[PDB]
Amino acid sequence: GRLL
Amino acid sequence: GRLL
Amino acid sequence: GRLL
Amino acid sequence: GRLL
Amino acid sequence: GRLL
Amino acid sequence: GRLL
Amino acid sequence: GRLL
Amino acid sequence: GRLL
Amino acid sequence: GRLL
Amino acid sequence: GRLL
Amino acid sequence: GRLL
Amino acid sequence: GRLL
Amino acid sequence: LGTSARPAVMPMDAWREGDKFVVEFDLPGIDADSLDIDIERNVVTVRAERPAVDPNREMLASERPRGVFSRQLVLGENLDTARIAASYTEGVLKLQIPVAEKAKPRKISITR
Amino acid sequence: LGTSARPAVMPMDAWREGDKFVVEFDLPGIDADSLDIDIERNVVTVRAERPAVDPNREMLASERPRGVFSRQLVLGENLDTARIAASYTEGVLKLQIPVAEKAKPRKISITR
Amino acid sequence: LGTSARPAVMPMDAWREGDKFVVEFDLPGIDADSLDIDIERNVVTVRAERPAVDPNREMLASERPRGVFSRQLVLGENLDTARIAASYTEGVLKLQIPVAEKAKPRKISITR
Amino acid sequence: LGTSARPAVMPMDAWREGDKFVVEFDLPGIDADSLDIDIERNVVTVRAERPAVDPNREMLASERPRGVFSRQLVLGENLDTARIAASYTEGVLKLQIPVAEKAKPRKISITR
Amino acid sequence: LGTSARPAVMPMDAWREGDKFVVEFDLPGIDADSLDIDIERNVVTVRAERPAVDPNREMLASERPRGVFSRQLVLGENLDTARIAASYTEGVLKLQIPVAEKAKPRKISITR
Amino acid sequence: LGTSARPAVMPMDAWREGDKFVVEFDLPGIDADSLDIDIERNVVTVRAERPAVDPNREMLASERPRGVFSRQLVLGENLDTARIAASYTEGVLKLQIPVAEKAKPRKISITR
Amino acid sequence: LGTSARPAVMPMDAWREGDKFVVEFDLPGIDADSLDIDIERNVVTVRAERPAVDPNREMLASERPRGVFSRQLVLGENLDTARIAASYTEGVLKLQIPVAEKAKPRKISITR
Amino acid sequence: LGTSARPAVMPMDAWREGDKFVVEFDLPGIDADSLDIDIERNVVTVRAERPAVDPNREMLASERPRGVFSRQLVLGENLDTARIAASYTEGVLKLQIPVAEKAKPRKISITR
Amino acid sequence: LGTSARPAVMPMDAWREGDKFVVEFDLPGIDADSLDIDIERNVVTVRAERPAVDPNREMLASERPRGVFSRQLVLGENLDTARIAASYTEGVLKLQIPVAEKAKPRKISITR
Amino acid sequence: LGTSARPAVMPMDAWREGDKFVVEFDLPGIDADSLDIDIERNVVTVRAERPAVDPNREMLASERPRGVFSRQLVLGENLDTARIAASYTEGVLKLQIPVAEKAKPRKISITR
Amino acid sequence: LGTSARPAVMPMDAWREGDKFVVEFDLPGIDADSLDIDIERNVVTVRAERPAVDPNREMLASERPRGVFSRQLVLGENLDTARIAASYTEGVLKLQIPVAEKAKPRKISITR
Amino acid sequence: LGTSARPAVMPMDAWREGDKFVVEFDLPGIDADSLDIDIERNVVTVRAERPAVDPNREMLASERPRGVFSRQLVLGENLDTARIAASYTEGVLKLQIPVAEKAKPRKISITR
Numbered sequence A, B, C, D, E, F, G, H, I, J, K, L: 001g002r003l004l
Numbered sequence M, N, O, P, Q, R, S, T, U, V, W, X: 001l002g003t004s005a006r007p008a009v010m011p012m013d014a015w016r017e018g019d020k021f022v023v024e025f026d027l028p029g030i031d032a033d034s035l036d037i038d039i040e041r042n043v044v045t046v047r048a049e050r051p052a053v054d055p056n057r058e059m060l061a062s063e064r065p066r067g068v069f070s071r072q073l074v075l076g077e078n079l080d081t082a083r084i085a086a087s088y089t090e091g092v093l094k095l096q097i098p099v100a101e102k103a104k105p106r107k108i109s110i111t112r
């Protein structure tokens, strides 16, 4: 779960 | 309908 | 004379 | 104990 | 009517 | 037309 | 003595 | 050249 | 070398 | 009575 | 260990 | 010349 | 512009003058038709409207607050709100509420 | 997080709809078990709690307000608080309080 | 300096202790002669004055707030304000108001 | 309180009404004795004073601005300041200055 | 009111739950007709509109944000955006995006 | 949007170039039809309007200032305002006012 | 002055015009030699420089921003960045990027 | 809450009373067990702690500052810190430090 | 440092002393060579420069404002600017301008 | 303390050094065990943790930021993220990413 | 106005000039009678007073700071405070304190 | 950039560890040549310089503070400053000063  |  |  |  |  |  |  |  |  |  |  |  | 839901507020002076409580509001340039004073058990509500400028009028300056003005005062039990007197002169709304002291009032003492 | 002593506040819309006064609160993601509506002589207090995140859960974002929510409304004398109706749907708490006008009400006149 | 019209405020803790509601104010260095507790139907008003420094006294530091202190509490209907107890010790004004629950109180249910 | 050296300012509306330039100030509760209108070659200065409250009067609220009010307007060459008309009603000071257009005025053209 | 060009933003919680990435938005009182979820190669955009109040309705309070809501999330390469699942309940929009780990991923070592 | 009564302002550079005084304004995307340069005895007023976006056009970004732009310059007595030259290129309004020195000017000496 | 590492930003309008996405920047008084448009897979970067004033020039006013201007836009996958068209007129940089919709696009449905 | 590393500060009055220097701190509701006065060559440090509320106690108001209080005074060479006298009454900590003037002190003259 | 285009300002006192108008500026540590007083039809401009510190000098403190100081006063028509007297002592620039009242001046009356 | 959901940020310098892009972070007093560098298609994420102080340790000063540090860089298409080199020395994390220019790159021309 | 307990501060430059430490204060328009320089073991205190304006004088501008000015400097052990020299000219108070280096001073080495 | 006269400050942790007082500074990327530790009777001064970037180097990001860093600590009489130990590792400057308690120290008692 990667997010900027 | 009165309110403070 | 009282008041909030 | 109620208070505004 | 001019004014600064 | 999409843009961030 | 007037001044703005 | 003067100006306020 | 590009970067946002 | 002096103090900083 | 004292310090201001 | 030292000073705090 | 001030609205019902976000009214503009107007400044108030309040003081006791012997047996009367007096309130004054700066409300310049108000049409009496707008002024409404609502009194509740112990709450005074002052509402006024000063109309917006004609949308077709180009103002060079337009600093004066317009729209809905409103202020609510919560008054003490000793104020005979029913006998309120209100006047509007020189752009000032003045309210006079008689003070009606209760018999043999409580005085709270503080222990040490 | 909001606490009893420093509650988080939730936004409110309020309006009169004919013979009823309506209040709506944005209270998304609230467990009904938490919702409490206390009515006082003329005061409505709304309190809700939305639990804090599991301390062992690593959030990547945690912007939503949590903890204790509370708002108090001071209602006018004309509101029949005893007959309040409350519903919670789509994350909105809606209150409906009947308006009960008194007989032959006061209209304050302003002198010039 | 705080005045009647713009009083200084003093910090307050408030909590319910079983059948009593307790309020505490930090009011250090107050002369008991100044302390006044006014109770209204359901409103407690605390007022104190701490005198200004002698104008002829050159202070090297003068951070402590002076003049008129005032705080008003709006209490719920269940508080027997008439039986208030007040004490002042270690610069703390403590108020104890008995809680007097009404018979068979309302519990508002929320529909879904 | 506003002073000569740091006057309080009062809000202003300004607009052109055909052949007249109009300025209005909110100046409620002003004694005409205080109002002074000074006109300079092309500068209008409005000054008013609203007295401070009796130092011996304990106000419960004192929000209304007091002391010296002043505003200076720099008017264009086309304003016949000498023919200014001033009136004060409903707490509003209204100024009417005739506009006196010069003959065959300049129109600046912009090159590309 | 929030617009397309200056949207209102809504609060978000985000966390990884094993093999799924979860995002939740507080969006109370939204008509499903408005909700739009746009997914781009690796960008999720959430857009909702909550209509403005009838201009003819006099609100006594109008604190709830209205108009266009929008939030854009830039997702990592490991998120299978194509398999997004979205639900709206209790005024909360919940998104579930499966996490699709790549084979034998890079681990960057740091020299001293 | 900027209005007559609250105009948007545009940035200005000003400098003396030998016998000419030069002023430049950033006014990009202005229709020449809007540009107006008014010169008063010794006052230059620059006014421009850049129209608002079609209300029916959904902008994704709308950062550029729109509406009425205005700036007034108070020029010294030595500026021959009557001979002003104005040009608009690359979105820059440039004004050139000849400097017309008076004969045998005053030089104020300071005593010690 | 704006630098590479801390650029000055310039205002932008953006909108979709049928099958084209349009971006406009206020960039008055820019030398075309400075303008650089870099396009990345889906990122448009606009960079301009407006030179600093001759250090030996005494400005009477110097409000216009100078130095490096830069803005980066992150474009959606549907924008055919390769076919960008750019023009600079009246101090406005206008970009036109064709929109290239994908076949049979996803429409995310929301469960209740 | 104030900590050792980020203490809460308490207000102080300081003045010279003939041959004594006096300092007073507002420290209401402090347990004497906490009060610590450390004196250094010429530095007085006052430290107090007022305990945090029982975590299990639901406060309705909790405005009073709690935790570690600390203030350090740098005293002049003429203060006989060794003979400090300290008292705590009505929530006020009062310090009395004798002033011990040196023999035939320096008076700096200023040249013109 | 203050520049021509963004001068440092210096504080001013101004008052009328019978038939003279007096202005004083705090301008400590100024070289008379820098002081320039320019008088325009009715405008007084004061300009001074206090040089920057030698770039090669390591200051331990450098709080004093340096560079270009400037202040412009717009004087009323009654000031005989031509007869200005200026002196600089104890770091104060004092200006004395005679007041030259016009014959039979206008007094504007206000209608009710 | 910085958390995953609200990380502390650390300052960064970035520059191109011929055929390499270099990034440096101030990350003093970090245990290498914490440092994690995640590289995504074109995104570099730097994460570090500096542990909180022993809760039982009384700090006299505790200004240094602690907890989770994180920074994400969005890199251009020309950066060969796969060949990143990272080193940590003197409390500085330095990243070196080779720049891999594409063949015959686009140069956007601007029309007039 | 600045007081003993809340003095106005005056700007200071400080630098070492070979074997002397120099301090300069901007103190324009000060009567020498007010200037007081107190030197303590290693502390220099500068105090000045500039009188308030005659209460009966109507100022048109009153920007200059008045009342008590004070600044305290904590000097290093190497300063021979006893040999201080002070002068006041052009509204600047200049202090010259000889530097008296100790024999064979410590140089702290840093390990790696 | 930080200068001698306006240094950049660096964060500090301080604590007592049994018989030693410890101070740590975040000073990443500092050349040991710059570090200077000056100890005065009871004052520790830490000074470091981190050089500015080559003016000819175009930085894409330049967030890290540069120039002169300085912090002064005023230590208590019990610190044996002469025996200070200093080390610099992982970009952290650590100081260890032995604590040297005096014989039979004063304990100030507080009267009631």
Ligand code: PRO
Residues within 6 Å of the ligand: M105, M106, M107, M108, M109
């Ligand atoms: O305690 C009491 O009963 C008194 C009576 C007046 C108010 N206090």
Ligand code: PRO
Residues within 6 Å of the ligand: N105, N106, N107, N108, N109
């Ligand atoms: O003065 C009165 O008596 C009227 C009656 C209604 C309200 N005002």
Ligand code: PRO
Residues within 6 Å of the ligand: O105, O106, O107, O108, O109
């Ligand atoms: O609706 C009712 O009647 C119940 C009775 C207690 C409060 N609610």
Ligand code: PRO
Residues within 6 Å of the ligand: P105, P106, P107, P108, P109
């Ligand atoms: O340039 C000119 O002469 C014209 C005449 C009116 C104003 N402009």
Ligand code: PRO
Residues within 6 Å of the ligand: Q105, Q106, Q107, Q108, Q109
């Ligand atoms: O440097 C390498 O090749 C290893 C492989 C996994 C990531 N790092």
Ligand code: PRO
Residues within 6 Å of the ligand: R105, R106, R107, R108, R109
């Ligand atoms: O005082 C004077 O008369 C000179 C003449 C030029 C300006 N000053």
Ligand code: PRO
Residues within 6 Å of the ligand: S105, S106, S107, S108, S109
């Ligand atoms: O769930 C689906 O498959 C549909 C297809 C278009 C987008 N949503």
Ligand code: PRO
Residues within 6 Å of the ligand: T105, T106, T107, T108, T109
């Ligand atoms: O200069 C001196 O010696 C005198 C003695 C007292 C202080 N000043």
Ligand code: PRO
Residues within 6 Å of the ligand: U105, U106, U107, U108, U109
């Ligand atoms: O109206 C008038 O004519 C008078 C004359 C002096 C000023 N006002």
Ligand code: PRO
Residues within 6 Å of the ligand: V105, V106, V107, V108, V109
């Ligand atoms: O328009 C073109 O085709 C040229 C080719 C390189 C970039 N611009």
Ligand code: PRO
Residues within 6 Å of the ligand: W105, W106, W107, W108, W109
């Ligand atoms: O450690 C030492 O002894 C040396 C002597 C001068 C200062 N440092």
Ligand code: PRO
Residues within 6 Å of the ligand: X105, X106, X107, X108, X109
């Ligand atoms: O008053 C005294 O003498 C005791 C001795 C130790 C400190 N206090």
Ligand SMILES: [Cl-]
Residues within 6 Å of the ligand: M001
């Ligand atoms: Cl508005």
Ligand SMILES: [Cl-]
Residues within 6 Å of the ligand: M056, M057, M058, M059, P016
């Ligand atoms: Cl009009």
Ligand SMILES: [Cl-]
Residues within 6 Å of the ligand: N001
């Ligand atoms: Cl929090």
Ligand SMILES: [Cl-]
Residues within 6 Å of the ligand: N056, N057, N058, N059, Q016
């Ligand atoms: Cl987790």
